[PDB]
């Protein structure tokens, strides 16, 4: 009769002070100690029908682990002190738990039974602690599949879906190849995700392990003019398509032409590449230490941009978002099974609040922008307040407030108000169709119009997460193995 959820309170592991955290581009969190991990795992009740494992979209938002993690099982193992068994059970489902332990927003935490009237259990932190302990003890080594049947799949894209598919096929016994455009493999993890949230050392170690396994990555290849789909199909049985989704939507408004506006993707990529190459000394990026930064469009990209600007010591940084601020508690129409929509105050914001003394504020809301300045570099940014109202048949619509005209200084502007599908129709060599820039495919039976070609990842899922990409990659690996051989265990 465990009573941990009653007699134990949720805690957090060691965290560096936000004020001093801007002086270094390293991890902003640490794993739980042994005692803390045991105490936190004691909270889990060994849930009957665990809602922390459903892994499905509810009301348009994902709930639970999409990869069906054995959360109660390794929670109990951690509580009992069994670490090797916990790591083995975790790896039974997640092949890259190191990334998820510090990147995933943990919808499982929100969609758990203990989340009602009490805080949930730190599933993400426990996973991070397990994987960190395993790596430190050196229990993670290449499996070296003795069974190798001559077969090629030639995955394209080094994103988490690509890595997962490559690992699954290699363990099956197929010698695959992963083509990446950028110098360093890892897809979004290497470049899009900040080093602060995920240092690239672990990513590089993972690629090293995969290479030792025999994935044989190849970089600096756009697989377009460089390599053609015809020869790809001729020399490979399957080809897959883990192209992801990097296309970014823009605003077709006047004033978005003055020099000083760059993509958030490009800015983050340049910053991380310079940091990896020469510690942001080659000056091959955008720096706004003495220049104001206005980032419009909230989300992970906006938070990463704000954190990068703060570490670059920008004089002023501001975040714009049209949607209203979240409340501090669940609303009537938002209960536990749904993903919570409450105030979070994640990283890149507490740092700004702690540092900025003259302007200890952030989260400018109900306004994106309107027509900006011109005549060379940016001088000012115009903003107008917007309100959500019910019109016609109780449908949300945006109304502007004429009396709320205001202007802000903006010497640098970033746009992160959403994303589009994969890079099409640029990559039209294949005959794969699309509807909304997403290659036509269905969850399960990823076969495309062309035989031997399988859609995967964000390319078909739209905008998703690393865990979703891993799940998709595992399913396509199973499907392609079955297609090539007839049977596929996983």
């Amino acid at each position: 009769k465990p009573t941990g959820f009653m007699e134990i309170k949720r805690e957090k592991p060691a965290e560096r002070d936000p004020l001093t955290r801007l002086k270094d581009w390293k991890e902003y969190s640490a794993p739980f100690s042994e005692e803390a991990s045991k105490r936190q795992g004691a909270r889990c009740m060994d849930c009957g029908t665990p809602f922390c494992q459903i892994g499905a979209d509810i009301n348009g938002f994902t709930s639970g682990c999409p990869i069906y993690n054995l959360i109660p099982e390794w929670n109990g193992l951690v509580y009992r002190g069994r670490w090797k068994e916990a790591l083995e059970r975790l790896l039974k489902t997640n092949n890259f738990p190191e990334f998820t332990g510090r990147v995933c927003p943990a919808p499982c935490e929100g969609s758990c039974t203990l989340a009602i009237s009490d805080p949930a259990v730190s599933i993400k932190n426990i996973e991070r602690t397990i994987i960190d302990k395993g790596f430190e003890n050196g229990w993670i080594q290449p499996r070296i599949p003795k069974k190798r049947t001559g077969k090629k799949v030639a995955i394209v894209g080094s994103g988490p879906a690509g890595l997962a598919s490559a690992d699954q096929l290699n363990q099956a016994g197929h010698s695959v190849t992963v083509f990446e455009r950028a110098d360093r493999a890892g897809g979004l993890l290497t470049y899009g995700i900040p080093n602060m949230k995920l240092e690239k050392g672990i990513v590089e170690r993972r690629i090293k392990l995969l290479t030792q396994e025999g994935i044989d990555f190849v970089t600096n290849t756009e697989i377009g003019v460089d390599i053609t789909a015809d020869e790809l199909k001729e020399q490979f049985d399957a080809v897959i398509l883990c192209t992801g989704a990097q296309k970014q939507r823009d605003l077709l408004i006047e004033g978005r032409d003055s020099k000083g506006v760059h993509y958030a993707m490009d800015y983050l990529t340049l910053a991380t590449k310079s940091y990896l190459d020469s510690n942001f000394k080659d000056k091959q990026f955008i720096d706004a230490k003495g220049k104001d930064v206005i980032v419009i469009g909230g989300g992970d990209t906006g938070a990463d941009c704000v954190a990068t600007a703060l570490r670059q010591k920008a004089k002023s940084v501001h975040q714009f978002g049209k949607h209203p601020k979240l409340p501090p508690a669940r609303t009537n129409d938002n209960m536990w099974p749904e993903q919570p929509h409450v105030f979070t105050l994640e990283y890149a914001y507490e740092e700004a609040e702690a540092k900025f003394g003259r302007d200890p504020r952030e989260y400018s809301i109900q306004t994106t922008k309107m027509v900006a300045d011109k005549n060379g570099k940016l001088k000012e940014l115009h903003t107008i307040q917007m309100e959500k109202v019910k019109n016609e048949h109780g449908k949300y619509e945006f109304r502007e407030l004429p009396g709320t005209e205001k202007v802000w200084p903006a010497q640098l502007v970033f746009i992160a108000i959403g994303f589009e599908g994969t890079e099409q129709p640029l990559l039209k060599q294949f005959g794969v169709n699309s509807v909304n820039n997403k290659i036509s495919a269905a969850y399960g039976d990823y076969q495309t119009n062309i035989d031997g070609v399988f859609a995967a990842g964000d390319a078909r899922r739209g905008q998703s997460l690393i865990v979703w990409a891993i799940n998709e990659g595992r399913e396509v690996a199973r499907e392609v193995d079955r297609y090539l051989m007839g049977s596929s265990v996983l």
Binding site: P50, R89, K92, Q171, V489
Partner: protein
């Protein structure tokens, strides 16, 4: 081993007590089980006296099930771990449960809204 044996014997004794049989000697001959999904032909051939209202699967199907389980277990060339059970708990990808999370949350939401769809 000793504790397992004693506990199993006690459980068997409880199972006998359910029907009121106080002696394993009598329970051994007695067939206090009723089949659900076994053909009457198979029952008569091998389980004579047992009840099967709807009949059901045949010896070929039984052999196919056993062979399937054996074959997947013996091949199983991906994992060194046992799959989680779903007998008294619900696991994604496991055996179906009538009161699954989807049904539970849908019913709760419908009752709290007083909503029909």
């Amino acid at each position: 081993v000793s504790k397992y044996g004693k506990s199993i014997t006690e459980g068997v004794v409880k199972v006998m007590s359910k029907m009121g049989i106080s002696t394993v000697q009598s329970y051994r001959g007695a067939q206090i089980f009723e089949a659900v999904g076994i053909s009457r032909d198979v029952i008569d051939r091998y389980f004579s006296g047992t009840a099967s209202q709807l009949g059901g699967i045949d010896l070929q199907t039984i052999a196919e099930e056993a062979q399937r389980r054996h074959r997947e277990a013996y091949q199983d060339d991906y994992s060194k771990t046992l799959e989680p059970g779903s007998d008294f708990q619900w696991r994604n990808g496991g055996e179906h449960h009538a009161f699954n999370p989807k049904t539970i949350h849908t019913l709760q939401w419908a009752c709290r809204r007083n909503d029909y769809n």
